[PDB]
Amino acid sequence: ALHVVIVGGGFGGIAAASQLQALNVPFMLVDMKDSFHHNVAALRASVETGFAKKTFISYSVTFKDNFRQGLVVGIDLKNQMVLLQGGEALPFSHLILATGSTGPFPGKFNEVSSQQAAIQAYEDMVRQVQRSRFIVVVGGGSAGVEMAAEIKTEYPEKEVTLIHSQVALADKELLPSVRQEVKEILLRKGVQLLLSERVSNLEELPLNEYREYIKVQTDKGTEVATNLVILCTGIKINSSAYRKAFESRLASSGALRVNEHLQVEGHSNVYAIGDCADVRTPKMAYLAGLHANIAVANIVNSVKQRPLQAYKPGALTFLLSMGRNDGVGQISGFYVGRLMVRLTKSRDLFVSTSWKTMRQSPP
Ligand SMILES: Cc1cc2c(nc3c(=O)[nH]c(=O)nc-3n2C[C@H](O)[C@H](O)[C@H](O)COP(=O)(O)OP(=O)(O)OC[C@H]2O[C@@H](n3cnc4c(N)ncnc43)[C@H](O)[C@@H]2O)c(O)c1C
Ligand SMILES: NC(=O)c1ccc[n+]([C@@H]2O[C@H](COP(=O)([O-])OP(=O)(O)OC[C@H]3O[C@@H](n4cnc5c(N)ncnc54)[C@H](OP(=O)(O)O)[C@@H]3O)[C@@H](O)[C@H]2O)c1
């Protein structure tokens, strides 16, 4: 009877599939790519030659028979089936939805693709950055703040402007001390900040592509002349697998309503983990891992007739790398500075934790 299907192999889904496989529980991991994407490092991968090969990890080397590359197009709840484009139906005793989020390319790569194509996409982007003397980053959230710092750190000679629609940078959940220091670090690197300005001609702009002249405009009348436009304008919940089947149980974002055991509302053998769960914390790979531990444990506790584990958030820990040499953040809601973030995140961007989880060695 027992068989756990995991929709999505991001941070959540490979933590779940690793755990299930190590317990020899019957399971199937489904993802549209052939490789796990360490997207935490995607921004460095768009800046450093030869780095992208280190951010994609073949699923089938790690999971073999229990991994299927396919696009989930629906879930049949009365027959307990996951429906794949091309006609495959996977039955389940327990379902884990780990579909994460979608957004503009450099920061997210969600295509039915091979590892070699994915890698080449990032290598193309490095060549775009390298060619461009003038670069605009759109969006001053936690993503675009890292984009701008990565460019200016790897190429100080380049001119980098960041345009953000708010008065302060990065997440509104962060201690004001972290958000002020993000700004100051950006300024000390030489990044041009254009705050409280929304870019207004986005739908006409060539993206991720060097041009001799691109005119960027804002809603306050500012014009910025540039060679390259990179979008860090934010993400959307990827509800493509499940929106039809779970329509009544969705948040307004598209995320799934859960209880503290991460069971989807109305169900006992369906769980949501990571960005697609309607937990009201910022979207973090770290929390994806923690939701994977709870969901896998609760499937086992659910079948073993043991009480279930609960998720109760602690104070926000959140680190911003500011190039490979700098950064700032907070640990359990307390400020931390360059030395800590530099070695914990900035140097490696957690890449080697994904290789370890996957039992592979980086190329
Ligand atoms: C952009 C960015 C993000 C960072 C960064 N840093 C951190 C960090 O330091 N710590 C952290 O915790 N999170 C960090 N994050 C956040 C992190 O990206 C996310 O919260 C993390 O990706 C969430 O993991 P999830 O598993 O929830 O979601 P993913 O999107 O990673 O994976 C979802 C997968 O489902 C897949 N999928 C497969 N088949 C599908 C189907 N048929 N239908 C729909 N989806 C499908 C997608 O293709 C995708 O691979 C960072 O430096 C940058 C620049
Ligand atoms: N753990 C980490 O260090 C880390 C790193 C990166 C991302 N993340 C997480 O991933 C999630 C996404 O973060 P994100 O930075 O990608 O998105 P985000 O937090 O939504 O930030 C993107 C920002 O871009 C702005 N924006 C959108 N369109 C714009 C335009 N035309 N001109 C100017 N500004 C524009 C948005 O403002 P409006 O809404 O006003 O448009 C928003 O403030 C977050 O939950 C984040 O915490 C975490």
Short mmCIF file of C-alpha atoms and ligand atoms in Angstrom, two decimals:
data_model
loop_
_atom_site.label_atom_id
_atom_site.label_comp_id
_atom_site.label_asym_id
_atom_site.label_seq_id
_atom_site.Cartn_x
_atom_site.Cartn_y
_atom_site.Cartn_z
CA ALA A 1 0.00 0.00 0.00
CA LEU A 2 2.64 2.51 1.10
CA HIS A 3 4.11 4.69 -1.65
CA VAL A 4 5.15 8.34 -1.35
CA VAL A 5 5.15 10.51 -4.49
CA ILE A 6 7.06 13.79 -4.24
CA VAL A 7 6.08 16.49 -6.75
CA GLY A 8 9.09 18.75 -7.19
CA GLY A 9 12.77 18.16 -6.51
CA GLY A 10 13.95 21.51 -5.20
CA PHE A 11 15.50 21.86 -1.77
CA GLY A 12 12.39 20.44 -0.14
CA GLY A 13 11.94 17.51 -2.47
CA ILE A 14 15.49 16.21 -2.45
CA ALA A 15 15.61 16.41 1.34
CA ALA A 16 12.43 14.32 1.45
CA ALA A 17 13.57 11.85 -1.23
CA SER A 18 17.01 11.45 0.39
CA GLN A 19 15.34 10.66 3.73
CA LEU A 20 12.77 8.29 2.23
CA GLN A 21 15.45 6.45 0.23
CA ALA A 22 17.72 6.10 3.28
CA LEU A 23 14.74 4.53 5.11
CA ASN A 24 13.99 2.25 2.13
CA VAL A 25 10.43 3.55 2.07
CA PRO A 26 8.78 3.15 -1.37
CA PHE A 27 8.78 6.54 -3.08
CA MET A 28 8.90 8.36 -6.41
CA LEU A 29 10.41 11.80 -6.97
CA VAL A 30 9.08 13.76 -9.97
CA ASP A 31 10.65 16.94 -11.40
CA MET A 32 10.55 18.55 -14.84
CA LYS A 33 14.35 18.98 -14.92
CA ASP A 34 16.95 16.22 -14.97
CA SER A 35 18.99 17.96 -12.27
CA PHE A 36 18.38 19.52 -8.89
CA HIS A 37 19.08 23.26 -9.10
CA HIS A 38 20.99 24.83 -6.20
CA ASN A 39 19.34 28.12 -7.08
CA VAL A 40 20.83 29.90 -4.02
CA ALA A 41 23.99 30.05 -6.17
CA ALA A 42 22.28 30.94 -9.47
CA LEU A 43 23.35 34.59 -9.21
CA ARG A 44 27.02 33.73 -8.85
CA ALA A 45 26.51 31.16 -11.63
CA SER A 46 25.44 34.07 -13.86
CA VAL A 47 28.61 35.96 -13.04
CA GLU A 48 31.47 33.44 -12.81
CA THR A 49 32.71 31.42 -15.80
CA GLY A 50 32.54 27.69 -15.16
CA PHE A 51 30.57 27.96 -11.91
CA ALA A 52 27.17 26.80 -13.17
CA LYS A 53 28.28 23.17 -13.57
CA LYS A 54 28.55 23.19 -9.76
CA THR A 55 24.88 24.22 -9.30
CA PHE A 56 23.08 21.35 -11.14
CA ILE A 57 23.04 17.79 -9.76
CA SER A 58 21.68 14.84 -11.74
CA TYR A 59 18.68 13.27 -9.98
CA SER A 60 19.09 9.85 -11.60
CA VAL A 61 22.65 9.31 -10.35
CA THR A 62 21.24 9.74 -6.83
CA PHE A 63 17.76 8.22 -7.02
CA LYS A 64 17.80 5.84 -10.03
CA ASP A 65 14.44 3.94 -10.35
CA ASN A 66 12.74 6.22 -7.81
CA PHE A 67 13.14 9.36 -9.92
CA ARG A 68 11.12 10.23 -13.02
CA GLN A 69 11.69 13.33 -15.11
CA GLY A 70 8.25 14.60 -16.12
CA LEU A 71 5.90 17.55 -15.89
CA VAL A 72 3.05 17.14 -13.42
CA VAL A 73 -0.17 18.42 -15.00
CA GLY A 74 -2.73 17.28 -12.43
CA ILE A 75 -3.56 15.25 -9.35
CA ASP A 76 -6.42 12.71 -9.29
CA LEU A 77 -7.53 12.74 -5.66
CA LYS A 78 -10.32 10.14 -5.83
CA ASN A 79 -7.97 7.59 -7.45
CA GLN A 80 -4.89 8.87 -5.54
CA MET A 81 -2.88 9.46 -8.71
CA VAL A 82 -0.32 12.01 -9.87
CA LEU A 83 -0.85 12.75 -13.57
CA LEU A 84 2.09 13.44 -15.88
CA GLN A 85 2.15 15.04 -19.31
CA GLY A 86 2.48 12.19 -21.78
CA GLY A 87 0.11 9.86 -19.94
CA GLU A 88 1.92 8.54 -16.84
CA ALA A 89 -0.12 8.11 -13.66
CA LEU A 90 1.64 7.49 -10.35
CA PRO A 91 -0.44 6.05 -7.48
CA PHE A 92 0.24 7.09 -3.92
CA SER A 93 -0.56 6.33 -0.32
CA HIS A 94 0.97 9.66 0.69
CA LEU A 95 1.65 12.79 -1.39
CA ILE A 96 4.26 15.52 -0.78
CA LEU A 97 3.90 18.70 -2.86
CA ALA A 98 7.23 20.61 -3.04
CA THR A 99 6.61 22.68 -6.15
CA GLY A 100 8.39 25.81 -4.86
CA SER A 101 8.18 29.03 -6.86
CA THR A 102 8.76 30.50 -10.33
CA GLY A 103 10.30 33.81 -11.40
CA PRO A 104 12.54 35.59 -13.93
CA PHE A 105 15.35 33.45 -15.34
CA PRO A 106 18.75 34.10 -13.75
CA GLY A 107 17.28 33.63 -10.27
CA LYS A 108 15.10 30.65 -11.27
CA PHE A 109 15.42 27.94 -13.92
CA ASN A 110 12.22 25.86 -14.31
CA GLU A 111 12.18 24.26 -17.77
CA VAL A 112 11.88 20.72 -19.09
CA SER A 113 15.57 20.59 -19.75
CA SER A 114 18.81 18.67 -19.63
CA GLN A 115 21.70 19.51 -17.33
CA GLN A 116 23.83 20.54 -20.31
CA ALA A 117 21.22 22.98 -21.66
CA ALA A 118 20.62 24.51 -18.21
CA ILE A 119 24.38 24.94 -17.72
CA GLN A 120 24.76 26.56 -21.14
CA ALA A 121 21.99 29.04 -20.32
CA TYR A 122 24.00 30.26 -17.33
CA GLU A 123 27.25 30.32 -19.33
CA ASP A 124 25.50 32.51 -21.94
CA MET A 125 24.46 34.89 -19.14
CA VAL A 126 28.05 35.23 -17.87
CA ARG A 127 29.13 36.27 -21.38
CA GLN A 128 26.34 38.90 -21.35
CA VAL A 129 27.51 40.34 -18.00
CA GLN A 130 31.14 40.25 -19.14
CA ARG A 131 30.36 42.16 -22.35
CA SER A 132 28.31 44.90 -20.59
CA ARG A 133 30.01 48.00 -19.21
CA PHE A 134 26.69 49.30 -17.84
CA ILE A 135 24.19 47.06 -16.04
CA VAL A 136 20.80 47.63 -14.43
CA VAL A 137 19.36 45.30 -11.79
CA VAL A 138 15.57 45.68 -11.33
CA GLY A 139 14.20 44.84 -7.89
CA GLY A 140 15.88 45.63 -4.58
CA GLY A 141 14.68 42.64 -2.61
CA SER A 142 16.98 40.04 -1.12
CA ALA A 143 17.57 38.56 -4.59
CA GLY A 144 18.53 41.75 -6.49
CA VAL A 145 20.72 43.02 -3.66
CA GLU A 146 22.82 39.86 -4.12
CA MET A 147 22.77 40.23 -7.93
CA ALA A 148 24.20 43.75 -7.79
CA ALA A 149 26.86 42.87 -5.21
CA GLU A 150 27.96 39.76 -7.13
CA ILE A 151 28.45 41.78 -10.33
CA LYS A 152 30.34 44.66 -8.71
CA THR A 153 32.51 42.27 -6.66
CA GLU A 154 33.56 40.15 -9.66
CA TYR A 155 33.89 43.23 -11.96
CA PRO A 156 34.55 46.42 -9.99
CA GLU A 157 35.26 48.23 -13.28
CA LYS A 158 31.60 47.84 -14.33
CA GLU A 159 28.83 50.36 -13.61
CA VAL A 160 25.94 48.77 -11.72
CA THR A 161 22.63 50.47 -10.97
CA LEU A 162 19.95 48.88 -8.78
CA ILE A 163 16.38 50.18 -9.09
CA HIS A 164 13.95 49.38 -6.27
CA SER A 165 10.37 50.51 -5.80
CA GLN A 166 10.64 50.81 -1.98
CA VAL A 167 12.50 53.10 0.41
CA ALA A 168 14.67 50.34 1.92
CA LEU A 169 16.30 47.22 0.45
CA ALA A 170 15.68 43.51 1.15
CA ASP A 171 12.95 41.83 3.21
CA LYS A 172 10.60 43.82 5.44
CA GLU A 173 10.93 41.00 8.03
CA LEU A 174 14.58 41.86 8.76
CA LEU A 175 15.99 43.94 11.61
CA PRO A 176 16.41 47.52 10.32
CA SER A 177 20.12 47.15 11.16
CA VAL A 178 20.57 44.43 8.52
CA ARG A 179 18.60 46.40 5.89
CA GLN A 180 20.57 49.60 6.52
CA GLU A 181 23.87 47.71 6.28
CA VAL A 182 22.81 46.05 3.02
CA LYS A 183 22.42 49.58 1.60
CA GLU A 184 25.72 50.81 3.07
CA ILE A 185 27.62 47.75 1.79
CA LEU A 186 26.16 48.27 -1.67
CA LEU A 187 27.20 51.93 -1.57
CA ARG A 188 30.73 51.13 -0.35
CA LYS A 189 31.14 48.76 -3.34
CA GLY A 190 30.18 51.57 -5.70
CA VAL A 191 26.68 50.44 -6.74
CA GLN A 192 24.32 53.18 -7.89
CA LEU A 193 21.10 53.04 -5.88
CA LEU A 194 17.83 54.33 -7.36
CA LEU A 195 15.28 53.84 -4.58
CA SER A 196 11.53 54.52 -4.49
CA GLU A 197 11.49 54.16 -8.31
CA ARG A 198 9.53 51.55 -10.23
CA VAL A 199 10.79 50.62 -13.70
CA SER A 200 7.94 51.36 -16.08
CA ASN A 201 8.87 50.02 -19.55
CA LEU A 202 9.71 46.45 -18.47
CA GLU A 203 7.50 44.77 -21.05
CA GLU A 204 9.43 46.38 -23.92
CA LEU A 205 12.99 45.72 -22.67
CA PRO A 206 15.29 42.99 -24.04
CA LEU A 207 16.27 40.96 -20.98
CA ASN A 208 19.45 39.12 -20.02
CA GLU A 209 21.05 40.31 -23.26
CA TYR A 210 23.81 42.83 -23.98
CA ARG A 211 22.83 45.70 -26.22
CA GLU A 212 24.85 48.77 -27.26
CA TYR A 213 22.05 50.97 -25.87
CA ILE A 214 18.98 50.20 -23.75
CA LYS A 215 16.80 52.97 -22.31
CA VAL A 216 15.33 52.05 -18.90
CA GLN A 217 12.55 54.30 -17.60
CA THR A 218 10.96 54.73 -14.18
CA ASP A 219 7.54 55.98 -13.01
CA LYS A 220 9.19 59.11 -11.60
CA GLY A 221 10.48 60.09 -15.05
CA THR A 222 14.07 58.89 -14.62
CA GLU A 223 15.87 57.42 -17.62
CA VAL A 224 18.90 55.14 -17.26
CA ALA A 225 21.08 54.23 -20.22
CA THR A 226 22.46 50.69 -19.98
CA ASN A 227 23.82 47.68 -21.87
CA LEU A 228 22.05 44.92 -19.93
CA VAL A 229 18.85 44.45 -17.93
CA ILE A 230 18.53 41.81 -15.20
CA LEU A 231 15.19 41.26 -13.45
CA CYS A 232 15.01 40.46 -9.74
CA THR A 233 11.37 41.57 -9.53
CA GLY A 234 10.16 38.65 -7.40
CA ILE A 235 8.65 35.19 -7.50
CA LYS A 236 5.26 33.51 -7.81
CA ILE A 237 4.13 30.26 -6.13
CA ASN A 238 4.28 27.38 -8.63
CA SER A 239 0.78 25.88 -8.28
CA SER A 240 0.74 24.26 -11.77
CA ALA A 241 0.74 20.69 -10.38
CA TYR A 242 -2.15 21.09 -7.93
CA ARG A 243 -4.29 24.25 -8.33
CA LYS A 244 -7.16 22.44 -10.04
CA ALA A 245 -7.24 19.50 -7.63
CA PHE A 246 -6.76 21.59 -4.44
CA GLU A 247 -8.63 24.74 -5.52
CA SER A 248 -10.59 25.25 -2.29
CA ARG A 249 -7.51 24.77 -0.08
CA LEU A 250 -5.26 27.46 -1.59
CA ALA A 251 -4.04 30.69 -0.11
CA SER A 252 -4.36 33.84 -2.19
CA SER A 253 -0.70 33.47 -3.15
CA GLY A 254 -1.37 30.03 -4.63
CA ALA A 255 0.21 28.26 -1.65
CA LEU A 256 -1.48 25.41 0.19
CA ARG A 257 -3.11 25.86 3.58
CA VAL A 258 -1.56 23.49 6.13
CA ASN A 259 -1.87 22.68 9.81
CA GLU A 260 1.17 22.61 12.09
CA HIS A 261 1.97 19.07 10.92
CA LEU A 262 2.11 20.44 7.31
CA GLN A 263 -0.86 18.32 6.24
CA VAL A 264 -2.82 20.09 3.52
CA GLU A 265 -6.17 21.29 4.84
CA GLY A 266 -8.85 18.64 4.36
CA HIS A 267 -6.33 15.80 3.89
CA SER A 268 -4.27 13.51 6.08
CA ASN A 269 -1.92 11.90 3.53
CA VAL A 270 -1.06 15.10 1.61
CA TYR A 271 1.68 17.45 2.79
CA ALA A 272 3.07 20.74 1.45
CA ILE A 273 6.68 21.75 2.09
CA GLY A 274 8.88 24.71 1.20
CA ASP A 275 7.69 27.73 -0.80
CA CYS A 276 4.41 26.10 -1.88
CA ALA A 277 3.24 25.69 1.72
CA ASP A 278 1.25 28.61 3.16
CA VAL A 279 3.54 29.13 6.13
CA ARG A 280 3.93 32.84 6.70
CA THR A 281 7.72 33.00 6.82
CA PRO A 282 10.04 34.23 4.05
CA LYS A 283 10.76 31.73 1.29
CA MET A 284 13.89 29.82 2.36
CA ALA A 285 15.65 26.66 1.24
CA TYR A 286 16.54 26.07 4.89
CA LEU A 287 12.86 25.98 5.84
CA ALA A 288 12.21 23.67 2.88
CA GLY A 289 14.62 21.20 4.49
CA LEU A 290 12.94 21.58 7.88
CA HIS A 291 9.49 21.01 6.36
CA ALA A 292 10.84 17.91 4.61
CA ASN A 293 11.99 16.44 7.96
CA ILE A 294 8.57 17.01 9.54
CA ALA A 295 6.55 15.73 6.57
CA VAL A 296 8.59 12.55 6.16
CA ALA A 297 8.53 11.91 9.92
CA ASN A 298 4.78 12.47 9.99
CA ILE A 299 4.11 10.02 7.15
CA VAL A 300 6.01 7.42 9.21
CA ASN A 301 4.31 8.48 12.46
CA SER A 302 0.99 8.45 10.61
CA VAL A 303 1.47 4.85 9.46
CA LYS A 304 3.22 3.69 12.65
CA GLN A 305 0.30 5.04 14.77
CA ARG A 306 2.59 7.46 16.63
CA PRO A 307 1.77 11.12 17.41
CA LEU A 308 2.76 13.66 14.79
CA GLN A 309 5.47 16.32 14.92
CA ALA A 310 4.68 20.02 14.82
CA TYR A 311 6.31 23.02 13.18
CA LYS A 312 6.59 26.17 15.31
CA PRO A 313 8.89 28.85 13.87
CA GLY A 314 11.66 30.43 15.88
CA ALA A 315 13.16 33.88 15.45
CA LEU A 316 14.15 34.70 11.89
CA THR A 317 17.63 33.64 10.79
CA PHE A 318 18.41 35.15 7.39
CA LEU A 319 21.77 35.77 5.70
CA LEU A 320 22.56 38.02 2.73
CA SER A 321 25.77 37.39 0.84
CA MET A 322 27.19 40.60 -0.65
CA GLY A 323 29.68 39.14 -3.09
CA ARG A 324 32.05 36.38 -2.15
CA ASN A 325 33.89 38.69 0.31
CA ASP A 326 31.15 40.46 2.26
CA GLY A 327 27.71 40.15 3.77
CA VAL A 328 25.41 40.78 6.70
CA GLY A 329 22.44 39.09 8.31
CA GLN A 330 20.82 37.99 11.54
CA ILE A 331 20.87 34.84 13.66
CA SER A 332 17.71 34.12 15.68
CA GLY A 333 16.73 37.74 15.24
CA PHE A 334 20.13 39.22 16.17
CA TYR A 335 22.55 41.12 13.93
CA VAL A 336 25.59 39.36 12.47
CA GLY A 337 28.37 40.87 10.41
CA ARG A 338 30.89 40.21 7.66
CA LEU A 339 33.13 37.58 9.28
CA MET A 340 30.24 35.27 10.11
CA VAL A 341 28.31 35.62 6.82
CA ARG A 342 31.50 35.55 4.70
CA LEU A 343 32.44 32.00 5.75
CA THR A 344 28.98 30.59 6.46
CA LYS A 345 27.42 31.66 3.14
CA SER A 346 29.35 34.11 0.95
CA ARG A 347 32.35 31.93 0.13
CA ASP A 348 30.48 28.75 -0.89
CA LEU A 349 26.75 29.67 -1.11
CA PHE A 350 25.97 26.29 0.53
CA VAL A 351 26.78 24.45 -2.72
CA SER A 352 28.60 21.60 -1.04
CA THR A 353 25.66 20.75 1.23
CA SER A 354 23.64 19.83 -1.86
CA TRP A 355 26.36 17.61 -3.33
CA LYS A 356 26.58 15.87 0.05
CA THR A 357 22.81 15.31 0.28
CA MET A 358 22.90 13.88 -3.26
CA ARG A 359 25.90 11.57 -2.60
CA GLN A 360 27.73 13.07 -5.61
CA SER A 361 30.99 14.93 -6.17
CA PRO A 362 30.95 18.34 -7.92
CA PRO A 363 32.49 18.36 -11.41
C1 LIG B 1 17.46 33.67 -5.35
C2 LIG B 1 18.05 33.33 -4.04
C3 LIG B 1 17.32 32.56 -3.14
C4 LIG B 1 17.81 32.13 -1.94
C5 LIG B 1 19.18 32.58 -1.58
N1 LIG B 1 19.74 32.29 -0.43
C6 LIG B 1 19.12 31.57 0.44
C7 LIG B 1 19.78 31.23 1.71
O1 LIG B 1 20.92 31.61 2.01
N2 LIG B 1 19.11 30.48 2.53
C8 LIG B 1 17.91 30.06 2.23
O2 LIG B 1 17.38 29.40 3.05
N3 LIG B 1 17.26 30.34 1.11
C9 LIG B 1 17.77 31.05 0.16
N4 LIG B 1 17.09 31.34 -1.04
C10 LIG B 1 15.72 30.88 -1.27
C11 LIG B 1 15.47 29.55 -1.97
O3 LIG B 1 15.62 29.84 -3.31
C12 LIG B 1 14.05 28.94 -1.95
O4 LIG B 1 13.25 29.22 -0.80
C13 LIG B 1 14.11 27.42 -2.31
O5 LIG B 1 14.35 27.29 -3.67
C14 LIG B 1 12.86 26.65 -1.95
O6 LIG B 1 12.86 25.27 -2.15
P1 LIG B 1 11.55 24.58 -2.65
O7 LIG B 1 11.88 23.26 -2.74
O8 LIG B 1 10.44 24.99 -1.91
O9 LIG B 1 11.36 25.06 -4.10
P2 LIG B 1 12.33 25.05 -5.33
O10 LIG B 1 11.70 25.91 -6.19
O11 LIG B 1 13.63 25.07 -4.94
O12 LIG B 1 12.01 23.70 -6.04
C15 LIG B 1 10.77 23.42 -6.68
C16 LIG B 1 10.85 22.39 -7.77
O13 LIG B 1 9.61 21.82 -8.17
C17 LIG B 1 9.79 21.60 -9.54
N5 LIG B 1 8.75 20.94 -10.34
C18 LIG B 1 9.02 19.78 -10.94
N6 LIG B 1 8.11 19.21 -11.65
C19 LIG B 1 7.15 20.03 -11.51
C20 LIG B 1 5.80 19.95 -12.03
N7 LIG B 1 5.50 18.92 -12.77
N8 LIG B 1 5.00 20.93 -11.75
C21 LIG B 1 5.48 21.97 -10.95
N9 LIG B 1 6.67 22.12 -10.37
C22 LIG B 1 7.53 21.18 -10.66
C23 LIG B 1 10.48 22.83 -10.12
O14 LIG B 1 10.97 22.66 -11.44
C24 LIG B 1 11.50 22.98 -9.04
O15 LIG B 1 12.65 22.24 -9.33
C25 LIG B 1 19.99 33.38 -2.49
O16 LIG B 1 21.23 33.76 -2.11
C26 LIG B 1 19.40 33.77 -3.76
C27 LIG B 1 20.16 34.59 -4.71
N1 LIG B 2 17.38 33.70 2.31
C1 LIG B 2 17.79 34.66 1.52
O1 LIG B 2 18.80 35.30 1.65
C2 LIG B 2 16.99 34.95 0.30
C3 LIG B 2 17.61 35.44 -0.80
C4 LIG B 2 16.85 35.71 -1.90
C5 LIG B 2 15.50 35.44 -1.85
N2 LIG B 2 14.93 34.96 -0.77
C6 LIG B 2 13.53 34.77 -0.67
O2 LIG B 2 12.86 34.55 -1.89
C7 LIG B 2 11.70 35.36 -1.95
C8 LIG B 2 11.77 36.33 -3.11
O3 LIG B 2 12.62 37.43 -2.91
P1 LIG B 2 12.96 38.41 -4.07
O4 LIG B 2 13.98 39.38 -3.70
O5 LIG B 2 13.20 37.61 -5.23
O6 LIG B 2 11.60 39.08 -4.31
P2 LIG B 2 10.93 40.17 -3.45
O7 LIG B 2 11.29 40.07 -2.08
O8 LIG B 2 9.58 40.25 -3.84
O9 LIG B 2 11.69 41.46 -3.92
C9 LIG B 2 11.57 41.94 -5.22
C10 LIG B 2 11.31 43.45 -5.17
O10 LIG B 2 11.33 43.99 -6.48
C11 LIG B 2 10.39 45.01 -6.56
N3 LIG B 2 9.98 45.27 -7.94
C12 LIG B 2 9.19 44.52 -8.70
N4 LIG B 2 9.01 45.11 -9.88
C13 LIG B 2 9.71 46.22 -9.91
C14 LIG B 2 9.95 47.32 -10.87
N5 LIG B 2 9.43 47.34 -12.10
N6 LIG B 2 10.75 48.27 -10.49
C15 LIG B 2 11.29 48.29 -9.28
N7 LIG B 2 11.14 47.36 -8.37
C16 LIG B 2 10.36 46.33 -8.62
C17 LIG B 2 9.27 44.55 -5.69
O11 LIG B 2 8.38 45.58 -5.23
P3 LIG B 2 6.82 45.66 -5.49
O12 LIG B 2 6.17 44.49 -4.93
O13 LIG B 2 6.51 46.93 -4.86
O14 LIG B 2 6.74 45.54 -6.92
C18 LIG B 2 9.99 43.90 -4.55
O15 LIG B 2 10.19 44.83 -3.49
C19 LIG B 2 11.57 36.14 -0.69
O16 LIG B 2 10.56 35.58 0.13
C20 LIG B 2 12.97 36.08 -0.15
O17 LIG B 2 13.03 36.23 1.25
C21 LIG B 2 15.64 34.72 0.29
#
